C-alpha cells in the first residue's frame, strides 16, 4: 500500500512500460544510453497523455451529439501549474505509473519535478480559473476555458542582493506535451479601421487583420471520463498585407515586422490588482474576445439549428444554448462585440440583440480597490476599435434613460452611473458596462458581495437588485489535497473512504475522530513528515538550513500594501527585539517564511521584499537568537512551490486590512492541509471561522466598521507611535539603519509611508496582532490541543470546494445541472 | 505491377494501416469523421518517419563506435523541397504506402500534394546542397549538413497584373513532421564586444549572446539503412541580459525586444548571384559558423581521444578526423573562427593552428560575376566581430609575405592579392580568405574551373597551383528520375534492371536499344503521358488551357540578365511576327513556358517578368495564331513544381552568355528526363554535349573566345539592330507599346538597356539562336528521330549524377572512400 493513488495492476504496468519505451525511441528519438531525466519526463508525459485522447475525443463528440447548454469561461488568466501528476490523479493512473517507472528503474518524483509550470496567471484570479476548470469537468459540464496562449508567463523571480530580479519565463523552451495546436481553425481579428454608415448598416472598414490560432489543452475531471477543453489563442500575422501593402519599405523589413502582430500574445501583464492602461493590454483583451466569440457562434450555428429547429437563424435560443462567464472586466469587450456581430453582421434590431446579450453574459467582480478597476481612455478605444466605442455610447445612452425614468430628477445619479467618465481624459468604466450588459453580477465571498451592494455598485443595486449575487470561492480538493498531500488524504481515506474527493462535505465525518487518539497522532505525524520534506527541499534547491521542530509560520501570496506583509514584518522584528532583551527566556521557536512576487513597476512592493531579506540578514545571524527564530524569503513563489510549502505550514498568515481582500483562496488551501489561521475578519476568512467556529480560529483586528469609524475620525499613525514603545523602537531601528548598516537611509520610504500615507493602516492592528500571535504560540506548546483544533479546521473545510462553487454558478447563474455521472468509458473506437 | 516502387507486402501494408490509424487518433487527436486531407497527410508523414528513426539512431551510434573522418557540409542554403515521397523512395516504402492508403480509401498522390516545400534555398547553390546530402548518405559517408533553420524560406511569388507580388512563406504554419528540435544542445554565439590583450592572450570581452538551438532532420540514403543528419540552427534570446541588463527601459519592452536576437534566423535572403552587404546577413553568416564549429570540436574532443589516443588534446589529428566543406564564401568566417578557438581558447601557436585550419577547410566557388562576390566593409566587421578582423589582418599579413618572397619586387601583385581592398570604403574580400585558408578550391564545371585559374584567381593559381581543382556538379537520380518520373524509370528498369539508381553510368547500356522499336515507342509514350498530366495540372491549379501536342519549350530557373530570358523573349516575338506575316503557312506548334523568381529588389528582373506576361497577353489572344503558339509564365517556380514541369518538357532552354553560368543543374535534370537541349557552350552544357556528342545537342552562339574578341573590339548593339530587320521590328514593337497599349513607354528600360548597356550581349546570339531553333522544330516534325536523339541524351547522362561528384570530393578533397554497403538492418534494438 503506497497510498490510494489507484491500482498498480498487472496488464497495465506492462502496458505503461511498453509505451514509455515506444515514445522515448519514436517520439523523443533517443536511446536509453543518452536519455537524461528530461527525456524520461517526456516519455512519461506522452505515455499519460495517450490515456486521455480517447476520453477527450469521445467527450467532445458527445456534446456534439446530445448538444447541451455550453459554458464559456472567458479569462485573461489561467494559472494551471504543472499537469502530469494532476492528470495521473484524475485518471487513477498514479500508482501504476509509480510502479512502471520504478520497474524501468526511475523515480517518478524526480521526473515530476522536471515539468515547467504553465504560469499563465498572476495569482488569485488566474488560479481560481484553473480550479474552476477542474470542477466544471468533474461535474460534467459542457464547459470551455478560453484565454491567450502567452509565450512568456509571469516572470521567474531571482533575489540578487536581497532585491527582486525579474527574468523571462520561457515555459515553452522545451515543448509542451499537453497542448494540441489547431492551425486549421485560425480566425481573423480586426483592429483600427473606421466605420462607414451605409444605407442598411454601419460597416467596420479599413481594419488591420491579426490571425488568432487555437491551441487546445485537455481538462480531465476526477475519475469520470470527461475531458474538457481549454482553448488558448496565439497571434499570427497574415502573410498578405503583412507583406502586400506595397510601394517600398523593404521585403526583409516587411517579414521582420510580422512580429508586431505576433507580439499580442507574447507576454502576460505581471500586475496583480492594479490597472495599467497600455494599448497592448487592450489588444490582448479584444483579441481573446473577438476570436472566442467566433468559435462560440459557429457551434451555435451548427447545434441542432444548422440541421433544423425553427429554420431561420433565430438567435432567440442563443441564451438557452450559450452562457459566457466574464472573469473580471478583462473580457468585458465581449458585450459590445456580441452586440456588433448580432446587429451589424446578423442584422438583428437593437432591442432583440440587447435582450439576447444580457441573457447570455454574467460578470464576476474580484476587488473593490480603485486602482485595480479598468477605466480605458476614450481616445484609445476611438483609434483602435471605433465601432465598439459607438456601441458603448448607445448602450450608455439607453441605460441612463432607464435610470432617468426610474429615479426622476436625480441628476447626480446619472453622472455617477454613467459608463462614460468625464474629467481630465474621458474614460469608459468597464465595470459599469459589465453590470449593464450582464444578467448576474457576483462577488467572491459573502462580505465582499455585501460591500459591492452597499458601497461600490449601490446605485446599480437600487436600480436592478435581482442581478447581484454571491458565490464564495473554492479550491479543488484534487491538486490541493490529494496531489500535494497524499499522506493526509490516506489517513483520512483510512477512516472515512475516498468519496470525499468529489464530495468534500463528507469531511464533517472526521469530527467524530477529534478525540480518537490514533487519528490525532496520525494527523500530527504527516504534518511532521511534510515539515521534514520541505525542510530538506530547502537545503537541496536553495539553502543554508532550517529547524523542522519550529512553528512554520508562512505567508505566501502576491506582495501588496493591502495584503500587509509589513504588519508581519513588524511582528517579526518584535520577537527578535524581545529575545535580544531577555535572551535566556524560552520562547516557542518559529521559522517565518514570507514569499511572493512583486509586480516589476511596484516600487513599494519591491522595497518590502528588500526589508524581509534585511530582517533575515540580521535575525538569521544573531548568535543570541540561535535556532529560536529564522526569517526566510521564499523565492519565486508559484503554483508548484505552493504545493510544497502549504502541506508543511503550521500557521497561515491572512492579515489584510478588513474590507480589502475580496475572498482569498490561499487561506482555503491552508485550511484543508492542517494549518491554523491567524487572520482578520476579511474575505472568506469570515466564512471559514463561521464554518470551524471562531474558537478554532485566531481572529484579530479591526472589523470593517472599525476601519470606517477610524476613517470618519481620521487615521493618524503618530498616535500609535506615541503610545506603543515596542512599535516606536522598531521604527527608529528602521530609520537609523540597524537593519541597513552601509545604507542607513535605505528604508525611508517605508517609514515615511507608514507614518504619513498608510492606506491600509498597519499600526492600528499591531497591538491586537502581536497579542493574537502570543496566543498561537501558547497553543503550539500543547501539541494535542493544537492537533485537535487542526482537526476542527480540516473537518469543516468542505464548503470551500470549487465543486460547491461551480454547482452554484451552474444552478443560479448558468441554468445547468451538475452530474457526477461517469461518461461511458474511454473504450477504443474508430468510427 | 504499378511501377518498381517496392513490394506492397502483406505483413507490411497491415503494419502501415495500423500505424496510420494510431497517429490520426493519438498524434493528430482527430477521428475519421472530422479528418481532412491534411490530417491524412500528417498520419502518413508520421507513419513513414517511424520507419527511419530506427535506422537514424543506429547510423548515428555507429559513427560513434567506429569513429570515421566526418564531413561537415556548411551552407547557408539547403533547398530540400517536400520530403515524404523522397523518404518513401529511399526506404523502398512507396508501393506498400500506395496500397495501404488505397485500402484506407485515400489517394496517396492527393496527400503528397499537401506537403509544403522546405524552400530554404534560392536556386542552384541551395539545391546542389540538397542533392549533395542525398549522395553523401547513399555513399555511406559520415556526413553532416549544417545550416540556418529559417522560418521564412524564399517568398511565394504571385503574379498580379503581370507583376510579381512577393508574399511570406510560412512553411512551418502547420508543423514540420520531419524535424526533431534539440533544445538540450543549445550553444551561445557572441556578438560585438571588444578585445582585451592580456598577458597570455587576447580575450573577446563584453559580447552580446545569442543562443543557437539545433533542429535535426534525417537524410536517408537510397536503400542502404544509412540515415544522416541535417542540423539547422534557430536563434533564441538568453533570458538573463535579454532582460537583466538593468535600470529602466520597461519589463514588457525587454521581453518584446527578445525578437531582436531571434530575427537572426527569421528569413532567407532572396538573392541569387547578387551580394547585399546587410548587417543581418553577416549575423546569419557568423551564427551558423560559430554554433557549427562548437558541435564539431565537441565530437572531436570525444572521438577516441576523449577516452585516450596520445592524451594531450593534440589538435594535430583534427584534420584526420574533420573535413569541413565551404559552400561558397557564405561560411568563410569558419577560417578566422577556427583560428580564434584554437589560438585564443585552446592556446596553440599561430603556425600550428594555421596548418590545422588549412588542412581541414576547402572552398567551392560558384560564380565569376563580380556583383555576386562577398566583399564585406571593414567598419562592419570592426563593430560586430572585432577579434575576427584582427585574425583576418594577421592571416593577410603573413600571406602577402609569402607572396612577396615568391614574387619579389612584384608590388601590383601584392595589392591585387590582398584579402583587404582599399578604396572608397575598405572591404575584406571573402573569396581571397577562402583560398588562403583552404587546401583545395574547386569550381563546378570544367570550363568554370579553367576560367578561375585563367582569369579571376590567376595570381592565386600561380602562387599555389596544387589547390585548384574541378568537380563538375551533378543531380540525384532519386528525386530527379525515380521520384518525378517513375514512368521513365520503369521502362528503363524493364530493360536494364534497377542497379542504375545508384550506379547511373549503367544508363550507357540503353544505347543498344536506340534502334529497338518497342523502346522508342515506350520512351515516346511516357513523355506523352507526362505532357498530358502537366497539361491537366495546369487547368486544375492554375488555368485557361494548353495543347499537349505542341513542343513544350521550357526555360525554368532564376530570372537574371545573364541567364537570358530576354533572348528567349526576342525569339518568341519572332515566331509570332512571322505567323502574323504568313498566317496560312504551317509551323510546328509550341507552348513556351518561362518560369522563375526575380529577387525583390532586382528591378530589371521584375521588368522581364512583366514583358513575358505582356507577350503572353498579345500572343495568347491572337485568333490568327490559334493553338500554334502559346506563351505561359510558370508561377512560383520551386522544387516541387520543377518535379512536374521537367518530365513534361521536350526542349530545355540553357541560353546564358558563354562564360557566365558556372555549371547549371537544371540542364542535367532535363537531360535524364527525355528533353533535348538548345544551348550555348557554357557551364556544364559543354560536358553534357561532349558526353552525348555535339550532333545530339543543339549548340549555338558565341563561345567564350568570341565573347572576349567582341569585348576587345567593343560590343555595339546598334550594328545588330541595323543589320537584322526582324530584330529591328521587335524593338520598335516594344518602343511603341504594341505589347503595352495603355502604357506605351512601360518597356523603355529593357529597350534602353539592350541598346546601350547590355552586359550579356543578347543581340550577338540572336541570329544563331533563331536559326538553331529553326532546326529543332524540323527534328520535332520527325518523331522517331527526335526520340532516338532523346535516347542518346538519357543514355549518356550518368556522368551527371551527384554520386559521381560526391565520390570525387570524397576521394580528392576529403580523403575518405565511398561505400555502397548496406548498414546492418534497422532492426529494433534497445540497449
Ligand atoms: C492560490 C494562489 C494564490 C492566491 O493566494 P491568496 O492568499 O488568495 O492571495 C496566489 N498565488 C499562488 C501560487 C496560489 O497558488
Ligand atoms: C535545379 C533547380 C535550380 C537550378 O537551375 P539552373 O538552371 O541551374 O539555374 C533552380 N531552381 C530550382 C527549383 C531547381 O530545382
Ligand atoms: O477571486 C480570486 C481572487 O481574485 C483576486 O486575486 C482577489 O484579490 C482575491 O481576494 C480573490 O480570492
Ligand atoms: O553550383 C550550383 C549552382 O550555383 C550557382 O547557382 C551557379 O549560378 C550555377 O551555375 C551552379 O550550377
Curated annotation (Swiss-Prot), chains A, B:
GO terms classed as biological process: glycogen catabolic process
GO molecular function, one term: nucleotide binding
PTM info: Phosphorylation of Ser-3 converts phosphorylase B (unphosphorylated) to phosphorylase A.
UniProt xrefs under InterPro entries: Glycg_phsphrylas (IPR011833), Glyco_trans_35 (IPR000811), Pyridoxal_P_attach_site (IPR035090)
Positions carrying Phosphotyrosine: 192, 215, 461
Residues of the site described as Involved in the association of subunits: 97, 131
Claim: Phosphoprotein is one of the keywords in the record: yes
N6-(pyridoxal phosphate)lysine, modified sites: 669
A Gene Ontology cellular-component term: skeletal muscle myofibril
Binding locations of AMP: 31, 64, 298-307
Coiled-coil portions: none
PROSITE patterns: PHOSPHORYLASE
Assigned keywords, A-Z: Acetylation, Allosteric enzyme, Carbohydrate metabolism, Glycogen metabolism, Glycosyltransferase, Nucleotide-binding, Phosphoprotein, Pyridoxal phosphate, Transferase
Cofactor field: pyridoxal 5'-phosphate
E.C. designation(s): 2.4.1.1
Catalytic activity: [(1->4)-alpha-D-glucosyl](n) + phosphate = [(1->4)-alpha-D-glucosyl](n-1) + alpha-D-glucose 1-phosphate
Site residues, Can be labeled by an AMP analog: 144
EC top class named in words: transferase
Activation and inhibition: Allosterically regulated through the non-covalent binding of metabolites, being activated by AMP and inhibited by ATP, ADP, and glucose-6-phosphate. The activity is also controlled by post-translational modifications including phosphorylation.
Task performed by this protein: Allosteric enzyme that catalyzes the rate-limiting step in glycogen catabolism, the phosphorolytic cleavage of glycogen to produce glucose-1-phosphate, and plays a central role in maintaining cellular and organismal glucose homeostasis.
Similarity section: Belongs to the glycogen phosphorylase family.
PANTHER family: GLYCOGEN PHOSPHORYLASE (PTHR11468), GLYCOGEN PHOSPHORYLASE, MUSCLE FORM (PTHR11468:SF32)
Subunit record text: Homodimer. Homotetramer; to form the enzymatically active phosphorylase A.
Protein name: Glycogen phosphorylase, muscle form
Naturally occurring in which organism (per UniProt): Oryctolagus cuniculus
Lineage: Eukaryota, Metazoa, Chordata, Craniata, Vertebrata
Amino acid at each position: 500500500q503506497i497510498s490510494v493513488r489507484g491500482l498498480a495492476g498487472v496488464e497495465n504496468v506492462t502496458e505503461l512500460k511498453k509505451n514509455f519505451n515506444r515514445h522515448l525511441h519514436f517520439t523523443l528519438v533517443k536511446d536509453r544510453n543518452v536519455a537524461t531525466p528530461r527525456d524520461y519526463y517526456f516519455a512519461l508525459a506522452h505515455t499519460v497523455r495517450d490515456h486521455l485522447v480517447g476520453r477527450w475525443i469521445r467527450t467532445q463528440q458527445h456534446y456534439y451529439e446530445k448538444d447541451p447548454k455550453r459554458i464559456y469561461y472567458l479569462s485573461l488568466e489561467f494559472y494551471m501549474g504543472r499537469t502530469l501528476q494532476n492528470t495521473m490523479v484524475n485518471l487513477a493512473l498514479e500508482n501504476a505509473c509509480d510502479e512502471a517507472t520504478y520497474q524501468l528503474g526511475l523515480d517518478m518524483e524526480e521526473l515530476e519535478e522536471i515539468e515547467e509550470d504553465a504560469g499563465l496567471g498572476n495569482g488569485g484570479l488566474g488560479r481560481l480559473a484553473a480550479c474552476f476548470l477542474d470542477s466544471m469537468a468533474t461535474l460534467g459540464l459542457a464547459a470551455y476555458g478560453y484565454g491567450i496562449r502567452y509565450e512568456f508567463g509571469i516572470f521567474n523571480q531571482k533575489i540578487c542582493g536581497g532585491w527582486q530580479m525579474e527574468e523571462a519565463d520561457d515555459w515553452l523552451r522545451y515543448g509542451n506535451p499537453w497542448e494540441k495546436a489547431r492551425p486549421e481553425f485560425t480566425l481573423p481579428v480586426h483592429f483600427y479601421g473606421r466605420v462607414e454608415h451605409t444605407s442598411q448598416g454601419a460597416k467596420w472598414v479599413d481594419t488591420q487583420v491579426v490571425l488568432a490560432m487555437p491551441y487546445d489543452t485537455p481538462v480531465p475531471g476526477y475519475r469520470n471520463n470527461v475531458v474538457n477543453t481549454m482553448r488558448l489563442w496565439s497571434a499570427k500575422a497574415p502573410n498578405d498585407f503583412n507583406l502586400k501593402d506595397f510601394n517600398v519599405g523593404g521585403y526583409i523589413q516587411a517579414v521582420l515586422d510580422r512580429n508586431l502582430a505576433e507580439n499580442i500574445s507574447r507576454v502576460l501583464y505581471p500586475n496583480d490588482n492594479f490597472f495599467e492602461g497600455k494599448e497592448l493590454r487592450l489588444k490582448q483583451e479584444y483579441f481573446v474576445v473577438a476570436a472566442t466569440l467566433q468559435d462560440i457562434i459557429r457551434r451555435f450555428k451548427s447545434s441542432k439549428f444548422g440541421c433544423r429547429d425553427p429554420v431561420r437563424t433565430n438567435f432567440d435560443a442563443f441564451p438557452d444554448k450559450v452562457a459566457i462567464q466574464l472573469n473580471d472586466t478583462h473580457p468585458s469587450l465581449a458585450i459590445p462585440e456580441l452586440m456588433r456581430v448580432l446587429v451589424d453582421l446578423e442584422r438583428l434590431d437593437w432591442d432583440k440583440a440587447w435582450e439576447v446579450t444580457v441573457k447570455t453574459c454574467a460578470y464576476t467582480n474580484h476587488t473593490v480597490i480603485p486602482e485595480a478597476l479598468e477605466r480605458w481612455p476614450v481616445h484609445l478605444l476611438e483609434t483602435l476599435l471605433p465601432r465598439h466605442l459607438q456601441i458603448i455610447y448607445e448602450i450608455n445612452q439607453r441605460f441612463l434613460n432607464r435610470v432617468a425614468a426610474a429615479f426622476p430628477g436625480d441628476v447626480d445619479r446619472l453622472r455617477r452611473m454613467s459608463l462614460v467618465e468625464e474629467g481630465a481624459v474621458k474614460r469608459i468604466n468597464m465595470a459599469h458596462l459589465c453590470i449593464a450588459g450582464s444578467h448576474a453580477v457576483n462577488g467572491v465571498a459573502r462580505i465582499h458581495s455585501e460591500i459591492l451592494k452597499k458601497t461600490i455598485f449601490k446605485d446599480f443595486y437600487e436600480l436592478e437588485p435581482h442581478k447581484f449575487q454571491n458565490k464564495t470561492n473554492g479550491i479543488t480538493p484534487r491538486r490541493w489535497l490529494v496531489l500535494c498531500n497524499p499522506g493526509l488524504a490516506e489517513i483520512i481515506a483510512e477512516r472515512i473512504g475516498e468519496e470525499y474527493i468529489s464530495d468534500l462535505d463528507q469531511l464533517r465525518k472526521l469530527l467524530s475522530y477529534v478525540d480518537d487518539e490514533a487519528f490525532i497522532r496520525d494527523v500530527a505525524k504527516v504534518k511532521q513528515e511534510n515539515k521534514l520534506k520541505f525542510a530538506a527541499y530547502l537545503e537541496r534547491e536553495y539553502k543554508v538550513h532550517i529547524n523542522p521542530n519550529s512553528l512554520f509560520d508562512v505567508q505566501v501570496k502576491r506582495i501588496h500594501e493591502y495584503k500587509r506583509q509589513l504588519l508581519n514584518c513588524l511582528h517579526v522584528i518584535t520577537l527578535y527585539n524581545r529575545i535580544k532583551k531577555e535572551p535566556n527566556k524560552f520562547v516557542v521557536p518559529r521559522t517565518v517564511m514570507i514569499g511572493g512576487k512583486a509586480a516589476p513597476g511596484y516600487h513599494m512592493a519591491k522595497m518590502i521584499i528588500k526589508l524581509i531579506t534585511a530582517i533575515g540578514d540580521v535575525v538569521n545571524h544573531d548568535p543570541v537568537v540561535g535556532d529560536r527564530l529564522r526569517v526566510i524569503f521564499l523565492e519565486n513563489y508559484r503554483v508548484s512551490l505552493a504545493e510544497k510549502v502549504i502541506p508543511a505550514a503550521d500557521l497561515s498568515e491572512q492579515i489584510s486590512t478588513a474590507g480589502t481582500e475580496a475572498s482569498g483562496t490561499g487561506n482555503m488551501k491552508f485550511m484543508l492541509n492542517g494549518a491554523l489561521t491567524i487572520g482578520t475578519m476579511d474575505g472568506a476568512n469570515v466564512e471559514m471561522a463561521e464554518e470551524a467556529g471562531e474558537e478554532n480560529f485566531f481572529i484579530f483586528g479591526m472589523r470593517v466598521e472599525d476601519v470606517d469609524r477610524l476613517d470618519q475620525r481620521g487615521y493618524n499613525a503618530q498616535e500609535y507611535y506615541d503610545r506603543i514603545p515596542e512599535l516606536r523602537q522598531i521604527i527608529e531601528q528602521l530609520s537609523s539603519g540597524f537593519f541597513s548598516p552601509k545604507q542607513p537611509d535605505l528604508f525611508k520610504d517605508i517609514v515615511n509611508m507608514l507614518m504619513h500615507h498608510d492606506r491600509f493602516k498597519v499600526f492600528a492592528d499591531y497591538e491586537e496582532y502581536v497579542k493574537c500571535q502570543e496566543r498561537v504560540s501558547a497553543l503550539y506548546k500543547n501539541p494535542r490541543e493544537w492537533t485537535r483544533m487542526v482537526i476542527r479546521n480540516i473537518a469543516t473545510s468542505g464548503k470551500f470546494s470549487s465543486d460547491r462553487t461551480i454547482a452554484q454558478y451552474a444552478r443560479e447563474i448558468w441554468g445547468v445541472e451538475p452530474s457526477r455521472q461517469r461518461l461511458p468509458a474511454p473504450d477504443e473506437k474508430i468510427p
